[PDB]
């Protein structure tokens, strides 16, 4: 029989992956959830007891969570929209361009291969006045890192330049699928250079752009480096990954810093659920 | 629109010319058939007309203006691809509608045109099924639907009926020839089946190794083949041929002498002499001597051959034989023929249907 | 066509300029003497190589660079393979592609590392792989693997069905069909996963900073962060920039060779 | 063989590796000192210690704690108090020549939980060419800034304005010099507004911050300045005045010999040319250092930190490092013996002169070589004798974060409201309630 | 190997059956041809015999044992696909070699088979180019090499010569027939072209809507079609059919009268009487009344009609006509015919070659 043999092959074939994911990650997830139910503090590990759901209501009722959450959500949707719209454009010029493609393919992927600390300091010194090369282009005394909307705009730029190559590369690799004769068949059926993109290119690459959009969005929600180094926790713009770190690494409140991790996991799970259920062409389909 | 091709070419590195010096004009509403061997450049020619292949040299004109550099959308022509390329992601109704939506027609009028042409292509209703569900003989119809609806400056079609059954071939051929005349639309159609060519064509064009060999009406081609290649290519079974020596009154063949008809003998007197010649005769112009009337028997020549094999088609038989000495064998004998296998039979020929060719050049002598 | 050539020319210089100016700024922060690393000028003057020879004085950075090569390559080699097996399973086979497998694969990438790293520390205290390559490659692969399984599945699911019918009809065993039919057609997916996984390993921090402490396993992304300077409070900016201009070169050389494969 | 693992911050290794080598010769081979690196980030060193200490790591022996961590590591029982030492000697090498500020700084509930090894203090730095004398009070700094602003000179005051702990160190110094404090000495109560003197001190500290942030011609960036930007703001000559730690002097001289500063063009000097080594680091002869330093005293100078009240010396808040023995350690008597060795006067000298970290033992402030390396030594001695301290409490990291998040951005201060807001905010940290901001 | 299908089915959810109770044994070395309309279960059957599609109910057997659950590699039958499936990264050479490399044969011996089979197909020189460079007839021809190389347990082929020019088909068919005889190897072949069925077939299978209609030699389907659909199915032009009324010695036609052969009339007495007759004649069995010599005039019967259109192909005239009354019309007539355009014609029919059918059942009653 085929089916009896194919499940038997399939269980060999997934074996190392499900083992390596489960055996390492099941205990850390289980412990990170279980610590959330209790008054655990890393400074007195013997002086701890079960607290029930109290670690969730005490974060969920707090304006510090909502201010940080609103900022991380607003940064997420605005950055991902720009990075996707730009991502298509960068993938197309990285595909179609006649002029020695290896030059663009390297020069457009090198930003992703810059270290996240050097990238964040590069932008931080770039925007301080009298010391950053593009800060001097502003009117006198501008100092845009000092207040809320301009510093948020600077971190969106510092995010878009560094991660639009992720989506541009998955878009390129997905776009290399599309059979040239179906493009020719659109072109001689009178499709313009944009009219074929919206009606032939995109709907054929739909299951590949889901991957780019999904892993990119689930990463964007947990921003940390580009908003801790550059303008570290100032004028209310702390993303929720900073809110988590500040309640764990530099406060030792393990019983709450784990709850502030479970709630971003849940909120990111709702975004993940919506993306797979609205696309339908997802991996298990 | 008129279409004019002037010395157009396509060529490739191993350079090798896939199409070479091709030159022709096509009148408004004219139905051209293109014919030849596989790999001779036919699709390559349609790709040059469509603009999907860049011309390596020569000139292309439409309606009196040059189009060499103009993109396929701007050329405003409709094509059926050899592969019948069909999208995924779009069920058959909207798969057919696609070019009309790019033309931005009113949505109701698009839908009405789709559900008309669904009947005229025998596709059943507009079906709402994705192409993955459809047979090869169904997919080629869906591909026809895209081309049928638009009303272009010209139709290009690469073997558009090839995957259909024998009834749907003749019935869709009726649907095509109706609509092409109804729209008065200039047409290039490509096929390996010369039996389509001889009924669809206002003219027919035949090509070998990237070069045209003859152009005409189907009756022009069949009555007057310009070379041994085209004389062998057209008709079914193919023309019978024999090497022979010219005679001052005719031609001395391996089986006897045929006196050449005086007017054509005067043309052979006007012509330059080859050192050898080939005759070509239709297998259906070979007959049983007993089935001729006297008024054919006074012109016909007669000879005898051993009936080795036969095969039948009801109205006719393909008597199979063979003879001593080198070539340059079938006779297509009438319904009343009494042949049996292994018999010695008394044959005759319509001596008026001898075409003659230069044996060194392969060029036909009989064509004017 | 002179228009088509002009258009692609202006677009190419626009894209190269757009991408590289913030990298040219990092290079200028590397090359300026510390008297003028705060001067506000994009184009340097009075250039000095002193910041490179500062970070290269002693083996502490160069050993961290060698560690980053070893851990980076072994991560991409293994994670592409065990992610490849699993992806081919969910993409073509009948029953392993259960929505449970993609569900657990997402949960590894969906949950924050900030919580996970302390349970991981007290595991490697026990198992004995702490501050050594295996105890750092292992968590790397586990957190890389969701991207590899989900990406490669979304490419293997798209190789046309009659190629696999032809492989069945031509009598090939499924692993030989994968080797000679599937993987050569899916090569852009393979190469993309290898690049995305390598670049993920090549600049990770939260794990590497917690699971290392000595030259046996310290890696360039942390060895660039913990540089000394003239004070406890003064940022060693020219050393940070000089570190990035060294540590990016493998991330060029890897891409430059592999992008040759990405064509249709 | 016995080895003692001495854990210290990433940037100090070039001092403590050499001092550990010297001790490994001097101990007579019973045991050796092995130097270990923590991370560079201060709040990250805390976690790498806290993990090992919770994980019972037997390879953890002696630690260089930051000054403000003592109450945390003491309340956790992670630092064993010097009063538990098997020898009876660690508490006696502490005290007997140690500066009184740093000595008190280590204590929790008056027990010594640690032994001081390094200390540091802020000072006021000024352009001695632009004013006749340095100002003695914050109103006088505002006066010289306002004067220079009108006159068309440098108008900025260089300070620690950002939301980093340096803002708390500055605020706490103002609050302490105003005569208040953040907490009760037992850390159980928030005392900022419990009596009108404490409110008055608190609103005076807040009002001085408000004033120097908002004054005409202040730095537009002042909401985001730290030690790094404070230094360059004076080196580029945009500020006239700066408050900073003592590392600034050699950094200026190193910039001046490089020609980074326009008011002290020492790169033109034929004797100073070549005073920087192959890796661009200033390494002068005695005469090159004297030439550079003498030329600096024409134009640049140092003064005692300026007061909140007339003719009152400021109680400056200290920085430093404290040694402690870990309660996971397996060689406790030897670890206390290693600590007593690391604090000997010749290793304090090495730490000060070669290492650039100010001594904690009083006798070195009498050494002419120490007095050569630190010209300002008399002002340091004085300030270290009368020091303020950070509010040492087990929840300090929460208190400091929630307090710094209440002040910043410094332009939005309003003294009465912010004294209320701090009283409320710090009380939530003492109660242990809500998220840390 | 024998193949046996037994009540097999395949049905697709809307469920719609594409094959309905299909049942046949196929002998060792037998050359079956499947034929039918578009989209009527052909390829679905080849996918069930290949094991590329699972049967919904009923059974399939090979070599005397059941195979429904067994792997395609357990069956080891060669297949040529409707799509002409090819490997686009491999060259044509390693495409054709691929089953040999899967079989692990020695490199020199594999290359000798590739040479011998390139020559055996008469495909080309050993071109070694990527398949995406090829013309249409070339792709289909290359897709034969995979199947023809390996000398399998059986061949399945789906429209294997459809894209080629006729001058190649007449060769390639002959090579397939030689090889199938030489290897003595069970074959299924599938085609639109019923002229191939009447030259390849050991047996031919005609199917409509997934249901088999007749099984037999080409001559048996041609001369004894079991029902009206198969009676309309093969030869050219299509068989001509009329309503007619029973006569006490034969039939009264809408235009004439025929006395029937007594044995055929006795079959019309063994069968129950329908309310009307349907009658059929092949166009090739229709003749001029001028064609009746002394022998023919005794066996024939006659009537007259206007030619509605006349058309010619040299060897035959297609004489279109229309009678008064309804049909259930073309005559195919000799190259000796002197009929002109639109002429009034006296007509003759062989009274032995007529066929008769039940007007309610559709069954051939002349069938035996
Ligand atoms: N994947 C599918 N989804 C839906 N229906 C299908 C599918 N495959 C086959 N069918 C059904 O089977 C019929 C086509 O049968 P089949 O595929 O055997 O045609 P075919 O034998 O290829 O005909 P031809 O060779 O003349 O094209 C269609 O009418 C369709 O309803
Ligand atoms: N893209 C290409 N690159 C290289 N050579 C090509 C390319 N396309 C076609 N050729 C070659 O040039 C010739 C052109 O033939 P063409 O592709 O027009 O086939 P065709 O004449 O339409 O016959 P068919 O109907 O079988 O396709 C082919 O024989 C082919 O080998
Ligand atoms: O979302 C922007 C950031 O994406 C990357 O970082 C994310 O993915 C890492 C995987 O290891 C995580 O550690 C990190 O927490 C995520 O933020 C990228 O590396 C960053 O540079 C981007 O700022
Ligand atoms: Mg073609
Ligand atoms: Mg088919």
3-class DSSP string for chain B: CCEEEEEEEEEECCCEEEEEEEEEEECCCCEEEEECCCCCCHHHHHHHHHCCCCCCEEEEEECCEECCCCCHHHHCCEEECCCCCCCCCCCHHHHHHHHHHHCCCCHHHHHHHHHHHHHHCCCCCCCCCCHHHCCHHHHHHHHHHHHHHHCCCEEEEECCCCCCCHHHHHHHHHHHHHHHHHCCCEEEEECCCHHHHHHHCCEEEEEECCEEEEEECHHHHHHCCCEHHHHHHCCCCCCEEEEEEEECCEEECCCCEEECCHHHHHHHHHCCCCCCEEEEECHHHEEEHHHCCHHHHCCCEEEEEECCECCECCCEEEEECCCCCCCCCEEEEECCCCCCCCCEEEEEECHHHCEEEECCCCEECCCC
> Whose C-alpha lies nearest to ligand 3, atom 16?
A219
Bridge partners for D31 per DSSP: D2
The CA dihedral of B266, B270, B275, B277, to the nearest 10 degrees, is: -50
| Residue E38 CA from chain centroid, whole number | 13
DSSP category for residue E350: E
Cis upstream peptide for E237 (omega within 30°): yes
| Cβ-contact C201, C75 below 8 angstroms | yes
How many CB atoms within 10 Å of residue B340?
A: 8
| Cβ-contact A122, A196 below 8 angstroms | no
Among A173, A196, A194, smallest CA distance to A186 is for A196
Specify the long-range contacts of residues A68-71, CB closer than 8 Å, at least 24 apart.
A68/A238, A68/A239, A68/A240, A68/A242, A68/A243, A69/A240, A69/A267, A71/A152, A71/A236, A71/A237, A71/A238, A71/A239
Among B353, B159, B189, B175, smallest CA distance to B260 is for B353
Bridge partners for B78 per DSSP: B155
How many CB atoms within 10 Å of residue E219?
A: 12
Cα angle: D325, vertex D328, D329; to 5 degrees? 55
Distance CA C17, CA C12 (A): 9
Bridge partners for B104 per DSSP: none
Scored b (16 or more CB within 10 A) or e, D181-201 reads bbbeeebeebbbbeeeebbeb
DSSP helix/strand/coil, C262: coil
Cα angle: E185, vertex E187, E192; to 5 degrees? 155
Pick the CATH number of E3-229 from 3.40.1170.10, 1.20.81.30, 3.40.50.300, 3.40.1620.10: 3.40.50.300
Distance CA B20, CA B7 (A): 7
Q: Determine if ligand 3 sits within 6 Å of the CB of residue C108.
A: no
The dihedral sign for the CA sequence B264, B265, B270, B271: positive
Annotate C119-175 with DSSP letters as a single string.
HHHHHHHHHS-TTSSHHHHHHHHHHHHHHHHHHHHHHHTTS-HHHHHHHHHTT--HH
Among D170, D237, D155, smallest CA distance to D206 is for D170
Q: Where are the beta strands (DSSP E) in D235-311?
A: 239-244, 301-303
DSSP helix/strand/coil, E91: coil
Best mutation site among A188, A198, A199 for testing chain B: the one with the most B CBs within 10 Å? A188
Provide the annotated binding site of B for Mg(2+). Answer: 43, 82, 158
Distance CA E181, CA E189 (A): 14
Cβ contacts of C163 on chain E, cutoff 8 Å? 85, 87
% helix, strand, coil for chain C, step of 5: 70, 0, 30
Alpha-carbon Rg for chain A, nearest whole angstrom, is 23
Residues ≥6 apart with Cβ < 8 Å to E310 = E317, E318, E319, E320, E339, E340, E341, E342, E343
Bridge partners for E267 per DSSP: none
Best mutation site among E33, E37, E43, E47 for ligand 1 pocket (most ligand atoms within 8 Å of CB): E43
Distance CA C231, CA C225 (A): 15
Distance CA C157, CA C182 (A): 10
The CA dihedral of C48, C50, C56, C58, to the nearest 10 degrees, is: 170
Among C193, C257, C182, smallest CA distance to A173 is for C193
| Residue E149 CA from chain centroid, whole number | 26
Cα angle: D408, vertex D411, D416; to 5 degrees? 85
Bridge partners for E216 per DSSP: E204
Residues ≥6 apart with Cβ < 8 Å to A138 = A129, A144
| Cβ-contact C98, A11 below 8 angstroms | no
Distance CA D152, CA D165 (A): 33
| Cβ-contact E149, E97 below 8 angstroms | yes
| Cβ-contact E167, B194 below 8 angstroms | no
The dihedral sign for the CA sequence E283, E288, E289, E295: negative
Distance CA C35, CA D255 (A): 6
Distance CA C92, CA C153 (A): 9
Ligand positioned closest to the Cα atom of B80:
4
Among D398, D353, D436, D320, smallest CA distance to D67 is for D320
Among E248, E274, E255, smallest CA distance to E356 is for E274
Cβ contacts of B50 on chain A, cutoff 8 Å? 188
Among B7, B362, B69, B51, smallest CA distance to B210 is for B7
Scored b (16 or more CB within 10 A) or e, B195-208 reads bbbbebbbbbbbbe
Q: Determine if ligand 2 sits within 6 Å of the CB of residue B44.
A: yes
Cis upstream peptide for B350 (omega within 30°): no
C-alpha separations of E189 from A264, E130, E169, E201 in Å: 62, 28, 14, 9
Best mutation site among C55, C232, C234, C236 for testing chain D: the one with the most D CBs within 10 Å? C232
The residue length of chain E stands at 368
| Cβ-contact E245, E251 below 8 angstroms | yes
DSSP category for residue E64: T
Q: Which atom of ligand 2 is nearest to the CA of B19?
A: 14
| Cβ-contact C181, C252 below 8 angstroms | no
Among D285, D38, D212, D243, smallest CA distance to D124 is for D243
Measure A62 CA to ligand 3 centroid, in angstroms: 26
Q: How far apart are the first and last CA of chain E?
A: 32
Residues ≥6 apart with Cβ < 8 Å to C117 = C206, C207, C210, C211
CATH class of D123-303: alpha beta
Answer yes or no: do A43 and D46 touch at CB < 8 A: no
Alpha-carbon Rg for chain D, nearest whole angstrom, is 22
Distance CA B51, CA A215 (A): 41
Cβ contacts of E168 on chain B, cutoff 8 Å? 37-38
In angstroms, the separation between the Cα of residue C8 and the nearest Cα of chain A is 6
Cβ contacts of B236 on chain E, cutoff 8 Å? 166
Alpha-carbon Rg for chain C, nearest whole angstrom, is 23
Ligand positioned closest to the Cα atom of E41:
1
> Whose C-alpha lies nearest to ligand 2, atom 29?
B39
DSSP helix/strand/coil, D429: helix
Residues ≥6 apart with Cβ < 8 Å to C136 = C71, C207, C208, C211, C212, C217, C219
Among D129, D371, D373, D358, smallest CA distance to D234 is for D129
Name the burial class of residue E251, with classes exposed (0-12), middle (13-18) and buried (19+) by CB atoms within 10 angstroms of its CB: buried
How many CB atoms within 10 Å of residue B325?
A: 6
Residues ≥6 apart with Cβ < 8 Å to D269 = D257, D291, D295
DSSP category for residue D266: G
Distance CA D280, CA E41 (A): 84
Among A94, A95, A92, A130, smallest CA distance to A110 is for A94
The residue length of chain B stands at 368
| Cβ-contact D383, D176 below 8 angstroms | no
Bridge partners for E65 per DSSP: E62
Of A182, A203, A206, the CB nearest to B85: A182
How many CB atoms within 10 Å of residue A149?
A: 10
Residues ≥6 apart with Cβ < 8 Å to D424 = none
DSSP helix/strand/coil, E53: coil
In the 3-class helix/strand/coil scheme, how is chain A assigned residue by residue?
Answer: CHHHHHHHHHHHHHHHHHHHHHHHHHHHHHHHHHHHHECCCCCCCCCCCECCCHHHHHHHCCHHHHHHHHHHHHHHHHHHHHHHHHHHHHHHHHHHCCCCCHHHHHHCCCCCCCCHHHHHHHHHHHHCCCCCCCHHHCCCCCCHHHCHHHHHHHHHHHHHHHHHHHHHHHHHHHHCCCCHHHHHHHHCCCCCCCHHHHHHHHHHHHHHHHHHHHHHHHHHCCCCHHHHCCCCCCCCCCCHHHHHHHCCCCCCCHHHHCHHHHHHHHHHHHHHHHHHHHHCCCCCC
Domain D2-120+318-385 fold? D-Maltodextrin-Binding Protein; domain 2 (3.40.190)
Best mutation site among E19, E40, E156, E194 for ligand 1 pocket (most ligand atoms within 8 Å of CB): E40
Give the strands of the sheet with D301-303, arranged side by side.
D156-158, D239-244, D123-126, D301-303
Phi/psi at B160 (5° precision)? -70, -20
DSSP category for residue D243: E
What does the longest C-alpha to C-alpha distance in chain A come to? Answer: 79
Residues ≥6 apart with Cβ < 8 Å to A121 = A229, A230, C235, C237, C240, C241
Answer yes or no: do A190 and B73 touch at CB < 8 A: yes
DSSP helix/strand/coil, D125: strand
The dihedral sign for the CA sequence B45, B47, B49, B55: negative
Residues ≥6 apart with Cβ < 8 Å to E174 = none
DSSP category for residue E33: E
Q: How far apart are the first and last CA of chain C?
A: 24
| Cβ-contact B280, B229 below 8 angstroms | no
Annotate E241-264 with DSSP letters as a single string.
EEEEEEETTEEEETTEEEEPPHHH
| Cβ-contact A185, B83 below 8 angstroms | no
The CA dihedral of A84, A88, A90, A93, to the nearest 10 degrees, is: 180
Bridge partners for B216 per DSSP: B204
| Cβ-contact B355, B280 below 8 angstroms | yes
**What are the residue ranges spanned by the domains of chain A?**
2-279
- Rounded to the nearest 10 degrees, the angle between the axes of helix C99-110 and helix A2-34 is 30
| Cβ-contact B310, B323 below 8 angstroms | no
> Whose C-alpha lies nearest to ligand 2, atom 5?
E133
Alpha-carbon Rg for chain B, nearest whole angstrom, is 25
| Cβ-contact B20, B208 below 8 angstroms | no
Residues ≥6 apart with Cβ < 8 Å to A237 = A71, A148, A151, A152, A155, A227, A231
Interface subset of A 176-235, CB within 8 angstroms of C: 176-178, 180, 207-208, 210-211, 214-215, 218, 222, 225
Residues ≥6 apart with Cβ < 8 Å to D331 = D2, D4, D31, D61
| Cβ-contact C185, E107 below 8 angstroms | no
Say if strands D111-112 and D107-108 run parallel, antiparallel, or are unpaired.
Answer: antiparallel
Distance CA E10, CA E22 (A): 10
| Cβ-contact E35, E196 below 8 angstroms | no
> Whose C-alpha lies nearest to ligand 1, atom 3?
B133
Q: Determine if ligand 2 sits within 6 Å of the CB of residue B18.
A: yes
Pick the CATH number of A2-279 from 3.30.365.10, 1.10.3720.10, 1.10.579.10, 3.30.750.24: 1.10.3720.10
Phi/psi at E185 (5° precision)? -110, 125
Answer yes or no: do D228 and C235 touch at CB < 8 A: yes
Phi/psi at B319 (5° precision)? -55, 125
Alpha-carbon Rg for chain E, nearest whole angstrom, is 25
Cis upstream peptide for E356 (omega within 30°): no
What CATH number does the domain located at B3-228 have? 3.40.50.300
Resolution (A): 3.5
Q: How was this structure determined?
A: cryo-EM
Instruction: Indicate left, alpha or beta for E58 from its phi (over 0: left) and psi (-120 to 50: alpha).
Output: left
Best mutation site among E317, E336, E352 for testing chain B: the one with the most B CBs within 10 Å? E336
C-alpha separations of C141 from A112, B171, C30, D437 in Å: 19, 63, 33, 34
Distance CA E246, CA E268 (A): 9
How many CB atoms within 10 Å of residue D326?
A: 24
Cα angle: C218, vertex C224, C229; to 5 degrees? 115
* Touching status, chains D and E (3+ beta-carbon pairs under 8 Å): no
Distance CA D156, CA D176 (A): 25
Q: Determine if ligand 1 sits within 6 Å of the CB of residue E43.
A: yes
The dihedral sign for the CA sequence C9, C14, C16, C17: positive
| Cβ-contact C97, C127 below 8 angstroms | no
The dihedral sign for the CA sequence A178, A182, A188, A190: negative
């Amino acid at each position: 029989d085929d089916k009896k043999s194919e499940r038997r092959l399939a269980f060999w074939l997934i074996a190392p992956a499900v083992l390596l994911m489960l055996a390492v990650t099941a205990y850390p997830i289980g412990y990170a959830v279980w610590l959330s139910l209790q008054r655990y503090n890393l400074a007195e590990p013997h002086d701890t007891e079960f607290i029930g759901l109290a670690n969730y209501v005490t974060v969920l009722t707090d304006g510090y969570w909502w201010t940080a959450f609103a900022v991380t959500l607003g940064i997420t949707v605005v950055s991902v929209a720009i990075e996707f719209a730009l991502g298509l454009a960068l993938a197309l010029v990285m595909h179609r361009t006649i002029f020695g493609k290896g030059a663009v393919r390297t020069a457009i992927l090198i930003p992703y291969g810059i270290v996240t600390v050097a990238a964040s300091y590069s932008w931080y010194y770039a925007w301080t006045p009298g010391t950053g090369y593009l800060a001097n282009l502003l009117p006198e005394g501008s100092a845009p890192l000092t207040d809320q909307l301009p510093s948020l705009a600077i971190v969106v730029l510092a995010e878009v330049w560094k991660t639009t190559p992720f989506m541009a590369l998955l878009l390129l690799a997905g776009l290399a699928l599309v059979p040239q004769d179906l493009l020719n068949a659109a072109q001689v059926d009178g499709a313009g250079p944009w009219k074929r993109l919206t009606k032939v290119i995109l709907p054929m690459i739909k299951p590949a752009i889901l991957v780019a959009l999904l892993f990119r969005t689930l990463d964007a929600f947990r921003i940390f480096d580009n908003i801790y180094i550059l303008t570290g926790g100032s004028n209310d713009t702390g993303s929720v990954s900073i809110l988590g770190y500040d309640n764990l690494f530099k406060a030792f409140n393990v019983g709450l810093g784990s709850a502030i991790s479970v709630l971003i996991f849940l909120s990111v799970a709702i975004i993940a659920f919506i993306y797979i259920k609205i696309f339908g062409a997802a991996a298990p389909g | 629109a008129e279409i004019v091709l002037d010395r157009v070419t396509k060529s490739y590195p191993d350079v090798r010319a896939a199409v070479k010096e091709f030159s022709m004009t096509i009148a408004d509403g004219e139905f051209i058939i293109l014919v030849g061997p596989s790999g001779c450049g036919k699709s390559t020619t349609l790709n040059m007309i469509a603009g999907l292949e860049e011309i390596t040299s020569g000139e292309l004109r439409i309606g009196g203006e040059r189009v060499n550099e103009k993109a396929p959308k701007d050329r405003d022509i409709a094509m059926v691809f050899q592969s019948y390329a069909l999208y995924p992601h779009m069920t058959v109704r909207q798969n057919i509608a696609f070019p009309l939506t790019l033309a931005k027609v009113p949505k109701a009028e698009i839908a009405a045109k789709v559900e008309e042409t669904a009947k005229i292509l025998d596709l059943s209703e507009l079906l709402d099924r994705k192409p993955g569900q459809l047979s090869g003989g169904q997919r080629q119809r869906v591909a026809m639907g895209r081309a049928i609806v638009r009303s272009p400056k010209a139709f290009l079609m690469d073997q558009p009926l090839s995957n259909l059954d024998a009834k749907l071939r003749v019935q869709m051929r009726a649907e095509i020839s109706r609509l092409q005349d109804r729209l008065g639309t200039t047409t290039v159609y490509v096929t390996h089946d010369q039996t389509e060519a001889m009924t669809l064509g206002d003219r027919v064009v035949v090509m070998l190794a990237g070069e045209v060999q003859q152009i005409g009406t189907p009756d022009e081609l069949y009555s007057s083949p310009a070379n041994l290649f085209v004389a062998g290519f057209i008709g079914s079974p193919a023309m019978n041929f024999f090497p022979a020596t010219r005679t001052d009154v005719g031609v001395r063949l391996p089986f006897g002498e045929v006196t050449l008809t005086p007017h054509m003998l005067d043309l052979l007197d006007k012509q330059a002499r080859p050192e050898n010649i080939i005759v070509g005769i239709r297998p259906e112009h070979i007959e049983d001597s007993a089935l001729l009337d006297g008024y054919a028997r006074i012109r016909a020549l007669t000879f005898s051959v051993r009936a080795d094999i036969v095969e039948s088609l009801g109205a006719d038989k393909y008597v199979h034989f063979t003879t001593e000495g080198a070539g340059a064998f079938i006779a297509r004998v009438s319904a009343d023929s009494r042949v049996r296998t292994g018999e010695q039979i008394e044959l005759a020929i319509d001596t008026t249907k001898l075409s003659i060719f230069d044996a060194a050049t392969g060029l036909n002598l009989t064509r004017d | 066509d002179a228009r088509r050539a002009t258009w692609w020319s202006v677009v190419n210089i626009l894209v190269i300029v757009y991408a590289l100016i913030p990298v040219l700024w990092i290079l200028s922060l590397s090359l300026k003497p510390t008297s003028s690393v705060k001067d506000g000028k994009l184009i340097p003057t009075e250039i000095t190589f002193a910041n490179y020879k500062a970070i290269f004085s002693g083996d502490a950075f160069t050993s961290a660079l060698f560690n980053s090569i070893g851990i980076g390559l072994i991560t991409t080699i293994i994670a592409v393979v065990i992610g490849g097996m699993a992806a081919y399973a969910v993409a073509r086979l009948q029953f392993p592609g259960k929505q449970l497998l993609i569900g657990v694969a997402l949960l590894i990438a969906m949950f924050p590392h900030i919580s996970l790293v302390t349970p991981i520390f007290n595991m490697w205290r026990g198992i004995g792989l702490f501050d050594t390559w295996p105890g750092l490659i292992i968590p790397y692969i586990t957190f890389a693997l969701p991207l590899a399984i989900y990406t490669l599945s979304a490419f293997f699911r798209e190789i046309p069905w009659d190629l696999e019918k032809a492989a069945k009809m031509d009598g090939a065993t499924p692993a030989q069909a994968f080797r000679k039919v599937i993987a050569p057609l899916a090569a852009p997916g393979i190469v993309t996963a290898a690049i995305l996984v390598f670049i993920f390993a090549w600049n990770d921090l939260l794990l590497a900073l917690s699971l290392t402490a000595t030259q046996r396993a310290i890696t360039a992304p942390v060895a660039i962060a913990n540089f000394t300077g003239s004070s406890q409070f003064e940022e060693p900016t020219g050393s940070i920039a000089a570190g990035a201009m060294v540590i990016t070169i493998p991330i060029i050389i890897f891409v430059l060779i592999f992008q040759r494969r990405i064509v249709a | 063989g016995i080895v003692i693992n001495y854990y210290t911050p990433a940037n100090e290794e070039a001092t403590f590796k050499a001092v550990a080598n010297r001790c490994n010769e001097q101990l007579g081979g019973r045991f050796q000192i092995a130097q270990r690196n923590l991370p560079k980030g201060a709040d990250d060193q805390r976690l790498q210690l806290a993990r090992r200490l919770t994980g019972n790591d037997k390879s953890l022996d002696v630690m260089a704690l930051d000054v403000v961590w003592t109450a945390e590591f003491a309340e956790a029982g992670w630092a064993v108090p010097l009063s538990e030492d098997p020898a009876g000697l660690a508490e006696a090498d502490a005290t007997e020549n140690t500066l009184p500020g740093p000595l008190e700084t280590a204590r929790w509930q008056d027990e010594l939980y640690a032994a001081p090894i390094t200390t540091n203090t802020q000072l006021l730095w000024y352009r001695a060419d632009l004013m006749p004398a340095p100002p003695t009070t914050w109103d006088g700094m505002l006066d010289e800034a306002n004067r220079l602003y009108r006159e068309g000179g440098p108008s900025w005051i260089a300070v620690q304005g950002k939301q980093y702990e340096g803002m708390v160190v500055w605020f706490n110094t103002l609050l302490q010099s105003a005569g208040g404090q953040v907490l009760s000495d037992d850390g159980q109560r928030v005392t900022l507004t419990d009596t009108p003197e404490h409110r008055a001190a608190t609103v005076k500290a807040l009002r001085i911050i408000k004033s120097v942030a908002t004054a005409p011609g202040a730095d537009p960036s002042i909401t985001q300045t730290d030690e790094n930007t404070a230094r360059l703001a004076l080196e580029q000559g945009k500020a006239a005045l700066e408050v900073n730690w003592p590392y600034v002097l050699p950094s200026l001289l190193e910039n001046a010999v490089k020609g980074g500063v326009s008011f002290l063009p020492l790169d033109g000097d034929p004797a100073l040319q070549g005073s920087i080594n192959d890796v661009g680091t200033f390494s002068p002869t005695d005469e090159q250092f004297d030439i550079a330093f003498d030329a600096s005293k024409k134009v640049f100078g140092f003064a005692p930190y300026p007061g909140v009240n007339p003719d009152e010396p400021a109680r400056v808040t200290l920085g430093g490092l404290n040694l402690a023995v870990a309660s996971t350690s397996q060689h406790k008597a030897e670890a206390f013996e290693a600590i007593r060795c690391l604090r000997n006067v010749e290793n304090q000298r090495y730490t000060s002169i070669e290492g650039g970290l100010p001594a904690v033992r009083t006798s070195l402030y009498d050494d002419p070589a120490f007095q050569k390396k630190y010209p300002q030594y008399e002002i340091i001695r004085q300030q270290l004798t009368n020091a303020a301290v950070r509010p040492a409490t087990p929840v300090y990291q929460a208190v400091s974060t929630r307090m710094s998040a209440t002040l910043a951005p410094i332009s939005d201060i309003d003294p009465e409201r912010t004294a209320d807001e701090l009283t409320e905010a710090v009380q939530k940290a003492i109660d242990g309630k809500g998220l840390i901001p």
